[model samples]
Target chain A: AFVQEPLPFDPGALEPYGMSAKTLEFHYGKHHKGYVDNLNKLTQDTELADKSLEDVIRTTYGDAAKVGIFNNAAQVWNHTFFWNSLKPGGGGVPTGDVAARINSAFGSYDEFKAQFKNAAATQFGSGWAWLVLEAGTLKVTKTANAENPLVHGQVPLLTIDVWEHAYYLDYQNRRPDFIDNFLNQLVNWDFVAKNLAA
Target chain B: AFVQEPLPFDPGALEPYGMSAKTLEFHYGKHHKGYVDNLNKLTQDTELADKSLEDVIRTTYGDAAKVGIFNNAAQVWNHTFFWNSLKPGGGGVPTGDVAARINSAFGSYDEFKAQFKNAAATQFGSGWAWLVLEAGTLKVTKTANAENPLVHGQVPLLTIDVWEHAYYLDYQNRRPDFIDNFLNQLVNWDFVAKNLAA
Candidate 1:
């Protein structure tokens, strides 16, 4: 059986300030693991079984017949990125090369934060908000379902999962609050900056 | 503030058969209530403030600027229909005019069920699976996010919400099980029959 990546941090590590361990136990353990399990089963008898996860996503991206494979593959990738996007005592203005880029990209750190939060907040359904380097310029974008910056030829720097399950156990219907808490108290700016530097 | 209709039955009534009251407290109390609140604020002092919910949905159906209004209005309508679509001890083959129609339209009750379950299970993101009457023909369909049959010129006879919030608390990612439980235990067939006669 194929496996899911372990959580980057303990489930309880982000508690009180961000989301609860229970949320991660369900969102990560059940939901994220379920996607990995489904992808393994879906590809077991096919060429996708041996291909890299990214290769499977790219090959099946626009092929209607392979939509199931694409969905699970992209989700498996997305959730891993999501876990790395947060840290126990994360969240603070970025520094170093990433800080200068934020200024050049969106005028100031405050503006960049506002744009990122808005993208995450306004995504309507199961989706993600991403800060990606698009053609060497940083941009804020949102995608529905399992879509990500990869399919659109951008280098993803950071992402916030906007699926209700990502926040509902802690925030219920208060998505804006969840976004606020994540940005102000729980985002791993170091991880985001590392992606930017790379 | 614009008001959401009270749930047609006690929140606890659907327990042990379908979703629990705790799910409804958030589904109805927060998610559904939040839409009504947003609609009121979005329409307040605007031309749409006094308009009927259906009228708001119809008038805003194709306007990109009114997408917010349309989402809230349609969701309010959808959630109400969804509540009525279930009863404590509902579900089983229909016994009246609806039974004959299901037979004629789908060849048999079993076929209708299989298709309906497939629609609910396969909805890719936050959305709904609906049994609607289109051109006097019964059909099973789905819509993403807050969309419904009204915008498609079909009469929505019944609906099953496939949004994560609708089932995540009770069933997590096992949407197939939730769909099966709703079909075999929670649907109010009488509601479908009534819609057919009307």
Candidate 2:
């Protein structure tokens, strides 16, 4: 059975960026952990139990009968990726190769920031906004519920979860503000750069 | 142009049922109001501007180009319906014709309750659980993100908003608890009966 990966940092670390420990306690300790536990139960004694998480996600996607499996597995992967995308004092513009790539892809960092924020804000419901590499070009995309870039054959470089549970405790109905805080104060550019390079 | 209907009760009225005034301040004051404001802007100087809210929803239901207008208009109607579906000291097994209807349809009130709760709990992401009348029979249903039974030719008798913003502040990730409390302490059986009779 797959296990929940440990959070990349202390739950309290993002408090300075407006993500309180209490929020992480539930977002990670409860919601994220629940996905892993549920995935284990759903896949138990089934062929999926022995497959890698990504394999399970890719295998079950779009099959209505296995939607439960896909939702849980994709969520397990997304939550882990999300945790790594944030750091206590991260966010702001990037540096090095990723920075040069952003300038190349979007013409300037300002335009990229605007597009990313718009995607995050406009995703109507429980979803995520992503910065991904598609066909050797950077793109901004959003996916609903348990969907992510992996299913679309794109490389996710960065993501900001717009699920209300991701920010309701900290930002309430001000999702735009939460998106702003995520972009301005909590994004881990180093991890994003690593993902892009990978 | 459509306007947000006044809340059926004070924002603080549902506090004793585990719905805090702070949650209402955002859910109703901000989120619900925002849909009305957005719908108005989206319909400005358009044919939909003169159409009834339900008409706007029906007209735009499957049209990709008008999805924005549909989301906002339908949300305005659904939020109003949701507010009327609850009261300060409501919920529990109903009485009168509606009670008879529930029993006739589901075999018993307990079974109906179980089915309704299941629908509410199992609806992933942002959505609503509903008690609806379909071809003269009572049915439990769920829809994702601004969708309501109206579009499916079902008459919604009552609804519970399952969007995280509906319960995140008070119950956090404990949505089942929120669903339980809604069934046990806040459901407006009288309003439900009125809808059923309509």
Candidate 3:
């Protein structure tokens, strides 16, 4: 509802999985923080400032004139969701409910990895590979730009930003390495199952 | 047109500007190498397999039946370009022909960055931020999903990949950070000059 500052994790704490300090500086200090700054600035003289980021996004999604509000608001919300997408011991094979759903739908973890890898690999630019629940089925979805399940009516379970700033310092142009690491070492599958359970 | 196995480099050798050893193993050993393996397998019995990667890309761009060929070809080409896009010490403002043309079209280096950042930041999904000489003027452009200036006949001066695989491990969902960092530290202006001169 409100613009929440990110939780207290060191920006580069995830370096064990490939995150780097310089990259984090640019990501948190410049990019993520920049979005917050711009979102606030863009809303100061507008009605959007008074509304929750989610409310603003939910309200003005399809309005052409409200695109600015949609951008800033969704970005703020996106960064917030993004910050929570990881933890120190986050990534690994899925366990429990999430694993079962994944195999049931996609047939196997490796297949799920292939599809998810394809989704992330073939996205062609800046966006995300989302694990979401639709009609009680765990599904993988990819969204371009500021668009998310929130706008399209899907219940997002978890996400991995395929955007470069997420890995440039540590991975550079080798995005697959970043993604592979995320899949093998950075994903919080329990976090995903909890979303489904909710 | 020579497809050689990726020779190992010290993964951390390019650190602060490139990726780590773990990242390289998966990126090169798995993803990038996978693309090559898949490309070879996909083309073994096909006419396109015997063609140059560019030929395969142009011939199969929009043909669904040929999607596999396009993916492998485009990735092969994209990765090559990406590797060529930077060096150990790269992207320190612009100069020579790249700088002059950028100034002529965007009004200044700062203006060009504003345009480039906007394009990269606003780009919907996995894609690229490009500095190219298009239609006779320098321009900043973003392309989606295996799309590139080459297909459109634009001369690519420089590119910073915005793909998640390009940065997810370093920045997660914070794309703007990756974009800003590339501009600041990873941009190989010399490469742009060479491409422009070509």
Best by DockQ: 2
- Could you tell me the interface RMSD of model 1? 1.3
Per-residue lDDT tens digits for candidate 1, residues A1-198, read 557888888889889677899899899989899899889989998888988777888899999899999999999999999999998888888898888888999999999989998999998888999989987789899999999988999999899999988988888778899999998888888888889878
Assess the local accuracy of residue A197 in candidate 1 as a C-alpha lDDT between 0 and 100.
76
TM-score of B chain for each model?
A: 0.97, 0.98, 0.88
Tens digits of per-residue lDDT, candidate 2, B41-141, equal: 98988878888988998999999998999899999999999999989998778999899989999999999999999999999999999999998999999
Candidate 3: where is the Cα deviation over 4 Å? A8-31, A62-72, A82-124, A164-198, B1-38, B64-68, B78-126, B131-139, B153-198
* Candidate 2 lDDT over residue span A1-198, tens digit each: 688898999999899887999999999999999999899989996999899888999999999899999999999999999999999998879999888988998899888999999999999989999999999889899999999999999999999889999998888888899988988899999999999889
In candidate 2, list every pair of residues with a backbone clash.
Answer: none
TM-score per prediction, in order, is: 0.94, 0.98, 0.64
lDDT, candidate 3, B62-140, per-residue tens: 8979787787777777666766666655667887777888888988999999899999887665677788787889888
C-alpha positional error of residue B44 in candidate 2 after TM-score superposition, expressed in Å: 2.7
Cα RMSDs, all models: 1.8, 1.0, 6.2
Name the best candidate (by lDDT): 2
* Model 3 chain A, TM-score vs. native: 0.90
By lDDT, the candidates rank as: 2, 1, 3
